[PDB]
Amino acid sequence: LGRFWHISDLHLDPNYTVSKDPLQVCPSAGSQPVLNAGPWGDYLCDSPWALINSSLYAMKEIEPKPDFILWTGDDTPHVPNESLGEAAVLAIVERLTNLIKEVFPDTKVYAALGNHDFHPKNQFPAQSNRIYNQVAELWRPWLSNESYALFKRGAFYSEKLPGPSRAGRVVVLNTNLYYSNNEQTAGMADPGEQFRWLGDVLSNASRDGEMVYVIGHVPPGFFEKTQNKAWFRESFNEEYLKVIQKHHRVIAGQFFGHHHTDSFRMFYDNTGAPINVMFLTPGVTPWKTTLPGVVDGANNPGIRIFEYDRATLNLKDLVTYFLNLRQANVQETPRWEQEYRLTEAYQVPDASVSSMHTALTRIASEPHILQRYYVYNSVSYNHLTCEDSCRIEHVCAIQHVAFNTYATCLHG
């Protein structure tokens, strides 16, 4: 049994300050007054350094010798572009990179850029640029020569897992190329040729007897905290689905972030068979989202470990840990705790596709399992009851990555 951490959406707010002025605590809160801010963060703000530092040392306490770490990006705060230029973006990515290197000096890390890890935000080019070049330098100890060259061109690459994993590979995507707010890739069918490359990597994996973990920042499909919100342009969503449908037999897991909330996505083939699952890990940042229509969309800080079979990459379990921010802020030191173990929460034997399908069916049919999933969705921040419209928004997002079937499901 191996273990790996998955962390995402740290979103440092460099200017977080415990201030007597509620409008000068954190620029990431915008114009929202931040009353009696605490040292470990605030639900209206992105993460203070103290919180990010606490999260890394919590990971070290829980599992100091993981087989590897997956890090799916989003390092900078939710502020206007004019507040956050290229030098600051790169300095922030470097500071977080250095913290991970300091706390886990002997650990391989597979890192993807998130949509905020660029200036201007979301405008990821399908070609080389100063940010891809400098991040390749920061992540060079983690990249093969081939991956270093690929990263400079498109911020995507693939790496063979080291032993004792028998025959595994991690594929790291730049899914920021597909975000509808990214004007750099408007009108491009296959920006950076990433889909062509991905298919080729996965065909090679089948030839070579390897199983693959696919990671990225922005997921396909819809955001479960609202209705009708997809990040990918429709054509990219369709292409991503086509890749999974063709190559699922070599894909042992998909690991994404961006939402900051804890959910998962099922993939099915045209016979109705479940063929893959994507795990959307929560964020370290607690920041209450400004996405229109989302009420009280904050979360507790979360981190996650997966347990896996080193011989096959089959996922055996996951454990999500959290910091109860409201409690931590009245205490001298933040102490992270176990939120849940997946097999226990859903009463399933492992984290296989069949087990996740069972989890969904229970979420969709048993009130107490729906509510359990819902509480965990915000990392145990919000305990109000998930009522009928909440249920449909979550169930449809989990079940339907495709635009048209998601739309039909929402009619329920």
Ligand SMILES: *[C@@H]1O[C@H](CO)[C@@H](O[C@@H]2O[C@H](CO)[C@@H](O[C@@H]3O[C@H](CO[C@H]4O[C@H](CO)[C@@H](O)[C@H](O)[C@@H]4O)[C@@H](O)[C@H](O[C@H]4O[C@H](CO)[C@@H](O)[C@H](O)[C@@H]4O)[C@@H]3O)[C@H](O)[C@H]2NC(C)=O)[C@H](O)[C@H]1NC(C)=O
């Ligand atoms: C699916 O699987 C296939 C294998 O079946 C992969 O194909 C291999 O891809 C690699 C990577 O591109 C190829 O290796 C590269 O070969 C280049 C050419 O090498 C010859 O020719 C040059 C000039 O003619 C000579 O200089 C050289 O000595 C050889 O005679 C090299 O230029 C490449 O160098 C790269 O890596 C090193 C660092 O390790 C750097 O020094 C270079 O700057 C450069 O970064 C590299 O060695 C290999 O030839 C391919 N094999 C076959 C059989 O085709 C596919 O890539 C894979 N598909 C995907 C999508 O992953």
Ligand SMILES: *[C@@H]1O[C@H](CO[C@@H]2O[C@@H](C)[C@@H](O)[C@@H](O)[C@@H]2O)[C@@H](O[C@@H]2O[C@H](CO)[C@@H](O)[C@H](O)[C@H]2NC(C)=O)[C@H](O)[C@H]1NC(C)=O
């Ligand atoms: C955070 O505040 C900085 C300004 O802080 C000063 O510069 C830092 C480098 C550091 O030395 C602090 O102690 C200083 O008080 C903002 O940076 C400025 O932003 C304005 C635009 O509003 C721009 O005109 C200035 O040139 C910027 N200064 C520098 C040095 O770049 C920064 O935008 C704030 N960060 C966030 C994320 O909101």
Ligand SMILES: *[C@@H]1O[C@H](CO)[C@@H](O[C@@H]2O[C@H](CO)[C@@H](O)[C@H](O)[C@H]2NC(C)=O)[C@H](O)[C@H]1NC(C)=O
């Ligand atoms: C980052 O977090 C670590 C872990 O909590 C902090 O290190 C602790 O610091 C206290 C006070 O100096 C010591 O009593 C502990 O022994 C330290 N623990 C470890 C494991 O080193 C560290 O101070 C934090 N750094 C920042 C910049 O906040």
Ligand SMILES: [Zn+2]
């Ligand atoms: Zn994020």
Ligand SMILES: [Zn+2]
């Ligand atoms: Zn994001």
